[model samples]
Target: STGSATTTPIDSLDDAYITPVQIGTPAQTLNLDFDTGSSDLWVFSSETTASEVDGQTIYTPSKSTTAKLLSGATWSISYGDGSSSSGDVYTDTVSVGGLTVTGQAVESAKKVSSSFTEDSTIDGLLGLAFSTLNTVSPTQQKTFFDNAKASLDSPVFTADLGYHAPGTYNFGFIDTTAYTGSITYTAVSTKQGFWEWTSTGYAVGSGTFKSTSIDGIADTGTTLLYLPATVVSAYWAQVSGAKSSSSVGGYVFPCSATLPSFTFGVGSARIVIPGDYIDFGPISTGSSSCFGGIQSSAGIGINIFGDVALKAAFVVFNGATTPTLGFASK
Candidate 1:
């Protein structure tokens, strides 16, 4: 029989997708961000200080009959936005959808950055990147998929994210019905443990495709599309009222301004993100200015194809051989 798991998106914040995951014996259910940017199955837990937890649910490993402590095991991780989590490690049964992973490395958070503590909607983050990126010391941990993929009919997973709506994350097998037309496959460089790929060219609106190759990773944890500084400038220039607003933190334009669609080349196919998706939303309620969803990668050498870009296509993160990424319009 083929092993597969399908997760429904829970009520999430900032257009992100969160899924319920069962960890340990007698199962402690937690709402976790299915992140492709990092590798660490960390959860807010009993190990965390009461003051730092805020309103998030905590996973109590001691309550589980199958929980085992990994001696001297510790993990600490920091994100691009400076959010961080550190904790002790425990081995337990972790399950998502129809797939269960025994002896899964579960990091129970003892301390989490303020960014995480303030985001009361999520309990933790479930990393889908390569296992080599796991942060545990003494012995690095393997992700849920990494531990269970060997038994799966095919070592693959797909992300079908929607704009502020329920979507699904499928493991082990791809459901061709989820997408339309053909799936465009591109080779991914996994040396960085991310679903990293290169875009051959891009164009603003319906203009010519400038052959400027951009290197970036498919990151679900991030919310915006970050490209090179020059590229970001070129796209925003096509908009009438758009300007780089330090007060707004990036490019901002009048909410009433007409927007242009942005397109990027992936292998031979070009994926275009709708203008409405590119406008993001109002900076704040009753505010006239709106933030641009596309920003400059600048200091961060790699561009990040975040939720805004991923939601535009059905993506497949295949672990076969050199690992290829498949994209299709849903």
Candidate 2:
């Protein structure tokens, strides 16, 4: 649950939530990457003019059984991630897995950056995670989940994963195969969705938080369990020679030694975080120092578990079916 990064599925169609639209005659397809982090669904517009990135696919909604312009709302968004794109507003039919939401308002980005574009296998992102930290709230004030809730299998869905490929956030769904068993659960921190706060504060390894518990905002979009510096230093201590390095930021380490195990509780599910997943990303000696895993965010922000950690558990989001986040297994 700590030190990783996963994606969320929000109501706005950006790089987080994907939509199902008709291209030509029967060219119905799915788009990916819908995030609460940003709004405006940029499907490459068949007119991207080649500003998109690789491994992403463009949606030709005109060929679909249904297609239409959302009308009037022109928009663009840039992320702290340095990724950016822009598109026009329009309404369309969107689907997640098999569920469908009619008249889903969206933005078809006329212009997109290289990373924002998907070539063939991937669709656009559909963010359906939390609304408090989203990007599409600029004007209409309607969140991606606000619109998606109408079509949600349950009102309780959220993103809860870490480290994955580009389009992983679109039409975000829960995979029950990983965390179905009974595990520990805690309420999320009320401060915000980020994995912030420590019972003590920055230590390194094996430190426990006296207040080491979560609070309320049931998170599913968050992919990592950001341990405070207090515990981070201790974690590396146990990894034998696993020193801190500045790869991305924070501390990075590399040791044949095993990493610590993490566990969280949900209604009845036991969400366990394995070590291998905790420590992904290639280990390298950077100009700064030694690395344990990947470093990021310096020490200001909380940690994200990302996909590397989430893939280990069968995380089930979609709160209506369950208000809990844990493993399920297919």
Candidate 3:
């Protein structure tokens, strides 16, 4: 009725989170990116071109007795970063932790972008966002979370992302011991097929909280906290020698700078991101410049509370009739 899995950051920069997932009848295990931004459970497979395959594991559907090809079904998806993948679809038994779902649509990648092939840490992505965002054509497919929700004791899942360590993803029930205080609930707008919600405001370090509405999506797939340009500029201004560099592609500051903590409001509760987390490591190997975890979302269209922000709290993606999100300090 419930399941729990440990997700770990793939690299030192906490680029992405990877969780082990079992697919097919005999159980082929693969490390997958648990992305909440998109809705397509796709993977590197036998169908993928050999040149595109690097150190990543590939799913062999032909090896699984339960794997059934979805006739004429195909899927293609592109991320904001320009990375993309496309493939044919197959229905198979997919399991995460101990939760299993039968006839889960598994998109087998026939092609992948260079970024994906370059980063072999993740075999594929298990989308946790609403099924409406699924890229499968002819008939959209449900995500692993969507299909498993009914069998779960509670139709909900929680993400407890860690900085450099491993975190737990729990299904069916919340681990009260995992968080310190009561959770602050907010209504989610599934109209955009994302965990989109509005934050009350934000504060830089211990500064006064600004009274404003910040609309954004809680995306585990994204690595940085992207906010409005004004808010981003304000945060960078507090740091010494911080500048938005064209060559660097983002705001960078001295690695030794005393960075300020970031705090964002969820209802009346304030979740604080430690300064150390904001210092997203050195810009280049042996370089003294470091990239800021918090950046401007001006070009992104929508503000995104990515892994940088989510790591600060325990987040709940409640898949009830009317979806909602819950945040609690951990």
Candidate 4:
């Protein structure tokens, strides 16, 4: 069987993408962030602290007759940005797009950090990463994708992210109409439980391509494209009035600056990110300084091809016996 869903960016900056998910027997719908960076299918629930509930939707397990407690099971996860959520676990019928999974482990959030409470756009997260990264205690639970793989027509999923527009996430099979040209396949390193791969090289705008192997993770959960400082510097240097601002915490430049395009290689394929995508938006409302969508991954220790990069191409996370990644221009 195949499953597909429309993912819409929540804010003008395209901070995160959200898709509707059905949970429990009665089919309660909640908007969730389908994150490939983490592996814990968690949601805000009745168990969450009242103060932390904010404007986000909550999943009430008691309302569903199919809900069963996974007694003694608990989960906790913290992201690179320091946002965190934790709680006990429950099993229930969960569905996405048109695919259904019975007795799927659904972590119920009892506690959440300030950042999650402040962001009212997403009610929870549905992890699409390898289950090895799941944070559940006692026994790790499989991700929705992992559980549905055996029943899918193909053991794969595709991410077609758009810049400030609605995108689609398709499971089981790739939609041929979603991309152009051919897909360039590459091996994935799942030892770290991430969709990690190495790019052949990169070029700043129309500059010469630097033949350097840059290892990075294709993370749909991350908001920006983070690369080595040297590479990030090279791109920003080409933009007039661009500088690393301590106050803003990263690179920022005049909002009117004519940014250059960024290109990264995958095998012989070169995926180009448009200049407009790099102009992330003004640092503050009505401010003339804009934050860059590409930043340095210096302290993070690994380069990350986040939404900024993924939105530039069609990405396939192939979950065969030996995992692989496929990239193609769209």
**lDDT scores for all predictions?**
0.86, 0.44, 0.95, 0.94
| Model 3, residue pairs in steric clash | none
> For each candidate, C-alpha RMSD in Å?
1.7, 7.4, 0.6, 0.7
Where model 3 places Cα greater than 4 Å from the true spot, the runs are: none
lDDT of 4 by residue, 134-198 (tens): 99999899999999999999999999999989999999999999999999999899989999999
Q: 67, model 3: CA deviation in Å?
A: 0.3
Question: Between candidates 2 and 4, which one is better according to TM-score?
Answer: 4
TM-scores, all models, native as reference: 0.95, 0.64, 0.99, 0.99
lDDT of 2 by residue, 1-330 (tens): 111123333322111223343323254454455343333444655655654545555566566556676455666667545667776655566554444555665556677666555334335545444433333434452444556665454454434433332222323343343334443333333235232212212222233423243222222233334544655555656665566645355555554556675443343343445565565434443332333442343343545544333444444344342233433321
Candidate 3 lDDT (Cα, 0 to 1): 0.95
As a whole number from 0 to 100, the lDDT of residue 148 in candidate 4 is 93
Off by over 4 Å in 1: 1-13
User: How well does candidate 2 match the true structure, expressed as C-alpha RMSD?
Assistant: 7.4
**What pairs collide in candidate 4?**
none
Model 4, position 89, has a per-residue lDDT of: 98
Q: TM-score of model 4 relative to the true fold? A: 0.99
